Amino acid sequence: RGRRDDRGGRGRDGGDKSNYIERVVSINRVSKVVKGGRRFSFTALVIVGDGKGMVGVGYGKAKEVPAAIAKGVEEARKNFFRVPLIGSTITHPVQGEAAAGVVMLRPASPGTGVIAGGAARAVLECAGVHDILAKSLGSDNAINVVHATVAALKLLQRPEEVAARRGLPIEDVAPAGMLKARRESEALAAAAAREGSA
Template sequence: MATNPSAGAERKPRDQARGGRDRSDRRDRRDSTEERPEDDLIDKLVHINRVAKVVKGGRRFAFAALVVVGDGKGRVGFGTGKAREVPEAIRKATEQAKREMIRVPLRDGRTLHHDIKGHFGAGRVILRAAPPGTGIIAGGPMRAVFETVGVQDIVCKCTGTTNPYNMVKATFEALTQVRSPAQVAAVRGLKRSELTARRDGAQAAAVGE
C-alpha cells in the first residue's frame, strides 16, 4: 500500500503549530494568574492553645489556633484550626476566617452606628460607639477584632467569661446586629434624611430637658 509522504509532512507542522499555540495559551493564563493582586487582608493571631495527649511511649502534643482576619474597611471573620504544628494550625484558622467573613457597617469608617450587646455561652459584651479620638478601649481578643475590621473609636466591656473563644464569638454575634441608617430606613419605608431628622430632633429634646 503506497503512502503519501507529503501528507505526513504537512500534518506534522500543523500539529506542532497547534501544540505551540496551546502551550502559549497556557503560559498566558498562568502569567495572568500570578500577576493577579491578592486581597489586602489583615490577620491577627488571638490565641494558641497546646494540648497534650498521653500515649504509650510519652506525650503527643497538638496546637489549636484562633485567628481574626479583616480588610480594615468593614469586613472581618474569625477561624480556628488544629494541627500537630503551630504554623499549620494558624494556616487552617486563617483559611477558615477568610471563608466566613461578614460585612459590618461603620459610621464615617471609624466607629459603629449605635450601641449593641452580644453574648455567646457565658460571655457577655457591650459595644458602644465613641467620638473621634477615643481609640479602641477593649480587651485583647476584642481589640484584635476591631483592629482588623477597621474600627478606630469604640468603648467595650466584657462581663462573664474571659475565654478568648467565647469573647470573640460574642463580639461577632453583636457585630451581626449592627444596622446602618440606610438599612433601618429601608425596613421602615422611610428616607434616610427623614430618619436622621427624627433622631436629631429627639436628641435636641433630650438635651433641652
C-alpha cells in the first residue's frame, strides 16, 4: 500500500456516501509452488464498520495489495454484523472461540479505553465501542482472533432480549447500575440528537 496521494484530471475519484471506518489488519504474501517456481499472491484481512456498532469482516485474495484490500472491502461490505452495546461499552463479559481463537470481551466503566491486542483492537475500533476490556487468549494470530472476536460479538445480546427470552419485565432481568447506565446513554443520545435536530 504505497503511492496513494494523487491528484487526477480524469473523470472522477468517485468519492460518495458511506464514509465508513476501514482498517487493514494484516498482509502476508501467500506463495504457491508450480512447475518452475513460486507464484506470489496476497491476502488482506479487511475490517470495515461505522461508529454505531455494525462490523464487517472481509478477506481479500488478489495478487496485488490494494486489489486484495479492495476485495476485502467489498466482501465485508457484502457481510455486515450487528453488535449490541450499552452507551459506548459492551453489555456483559463473554468468551468467543473460533476453533483456536479465544477472546474474552469484558465491559468496564467509561473512560478506561479500548484495551485489546491489534486484531481485536481493529475490530473494536471500527465498531461503536470506546471503553471495553478484552484479551486474546490462544492462537496468537490475526485471522482467528478477528473471527473469534466476531463470534464473541455474536454471543452478545440486549438486556431486553434476555428479558424477552425469559418473559420477564425488565428491571427483573438486569441489575440496577446497568439500567442507570441505560438512562445515561439514552440521555446523552437525547442531548446530542436534539442538538442534531437544531
